[PDB]
Write a protein that binds this ligand. Structure first.
Ligand SMILES: N[C@@H]1[C@@H](O)[C@H](O)[C@@H](CO)O[C@H]1O
Ligand SMILES: N[C@@H]1[C@@H](O)[C@H](O)[C@@H](CO)O[C@H]1O
Length: 242
């Protein structure tokens, strides 16, 4: 669905949306007061969302004695009830940072990103008949930030509301740039008025990323050809970095 050089490019873009840098932040770990507990890694795995659990479980299977195995029974509890409780979990950000020095841990992160986020976004893009590279990037960024759940703010609901507005999908003859514009605008409205109020501040400050995607659409760079200019937070970046 995406080129190797398009996927490197999309990862560097999405890293700028999330951490203002094109270098993937495997070692990132913060509490953000968004109702999600601790947020970590390249795709922002979360204590509350069952994200951070799948990574550490898989890692513990590859390496049964790692510095993060003691956090595991607390993590199962949070994932169980989607709990944003920062505590139960002291020291974990530092150990997530340290585990990130291991290429194997970083790889588990890649594997979950592909299993939870990239592949499903690509499957959703193919059911849409979507086939501009920019649309794929926007679906992928969106699935990372909003998730693939059943809420009104998840990617499936936004896709459904985009398809309702333009009476159809690109595989059905609706112009794809029109479907994409609508989706980008519906996304910005969800970020600025999320149904889950705990993520309001964290999401309403993130909408510059939707503008950067919108900017590429209006500039006709729907195929993600280089060079790509991203300046989401004020800092300018010419992708791909080399
Ligand atoms: N709000 C986001 C959720 O959207 C996501 O789980 C994560 C990764 O981007 O980080 C947060 O900031
Ligand atoms: N879309 C899937 C559901 O259909 C499934 O029942 C559930 C548990 O796997 O997670 C989600």
């Amino acid at each position: 669905q995406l080129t190797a050089q398009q996927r490197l490019l999309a990862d560097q873009i999405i890293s700028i949306f999330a951490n203002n840098t094109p270098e993937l932040q495997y070692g990132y770990a913060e509490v953000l007061d968004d109702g999600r507990g601790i947020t970590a890694g390249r795709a922002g795995f979360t204590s509350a969302t069952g994200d951070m659990l799948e990574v550490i479980q898989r890692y513990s299977r590859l390496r049964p004695d790692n510095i993060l195995v003691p956090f595991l029974p607390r993590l199962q509890q949070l994932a169980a009830s989607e709990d944003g409780s920062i505590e139960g979990l002291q020291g974990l950000p530092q150990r997530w940072a340290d585990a990130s020095q291991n290429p194997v841990f970083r790889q588990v992160q890649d594997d979950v990103v592909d299993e939870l986020y990239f592949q499903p976004a690509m499957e959703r893009a193919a059911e849409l008949g979507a086939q501009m590279p920019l649309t794929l990037l926007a679906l992928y960024d969106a699935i990372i930030q909003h998730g693939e759940g059943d809420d009104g703010d998840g990617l499936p609901a936004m896709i459904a509301r985009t398809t309702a507005k333009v009476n159809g999908i690109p595989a059905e003859g609706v112009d794809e740039r029109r479907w994409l514009k609508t989706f980008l605008k519906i996304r910005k409205q969800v970020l600025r008025h999320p149904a889950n109020l705990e993520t309001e501040d964290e999401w309403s400050e993130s909408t510059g990323r939707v503008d950067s995607l919108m900017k590429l659409l209006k500039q006709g760079n729907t195929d993600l050809h280089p060079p790509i200019r991203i300046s989401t937070w004020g800092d300018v970046f010419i992708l791909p970095i080399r």
